[PDB]
Amino acid sequence: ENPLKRLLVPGEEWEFEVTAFYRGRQVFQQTISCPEGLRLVGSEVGDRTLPGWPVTLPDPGMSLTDRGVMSYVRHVLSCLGGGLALWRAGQWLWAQRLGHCHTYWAVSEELLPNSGHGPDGEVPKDKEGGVFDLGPFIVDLITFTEGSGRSPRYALWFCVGESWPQDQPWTKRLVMVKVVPTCLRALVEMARVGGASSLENTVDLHISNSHPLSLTSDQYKAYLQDLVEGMDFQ
């Protein structure tokens, strides 16, 4: 009945757009879909009994141009171990550091990881750490559709093997990874265009077996409200 509830139906998989940057330069981008989430790894493998879709960050390559810098990037990648795990449990996203690279995270802008208020936290090594909750996001998305709130942020940025670049240019960090659950991008874009008319717009949730939905703003906000009443709040 409510198409947005498919976001949370057990067995469905979200698409995650994973984009990696070495020293401010995009070097990798893949979309990933896996019930056990994903693991950012640096090709040491080394275990094949870990859950999660292994996302292998590319070698920095060999060039006579930035040899010294790429050497550091390579070292970081060589210390990823089991990697950075990111996975979903219902309305919650979880991250865990399985290797030896300390990793810090924030939910931030699409284009800018460090908004200036520091990281949201450090990814823990021996337990799951919560990095996203769809509950508040949807509450904030509804506020946005009502004009009385900015659009909620949904871009997960990870800084791997270095401190968070607070008050520093993020392009100096060796290994920055952005992870966008693309359903959230689509939800935000749908609200933005939905505010401009009472006509139908198309939103694609980018989850398993998804198809584009055609909704007016009224129908969309009704569904957001129905969705939010079905989610958990502490």
Partner: peptide, 10 residues
């Protein structure tokens, strides 16, 4: 301004 790597173990 060389990177300070934060990796445990080694």
């Amino acid at each position: 301004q060389e990177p300070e790597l934060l990796i445990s173990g080694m």
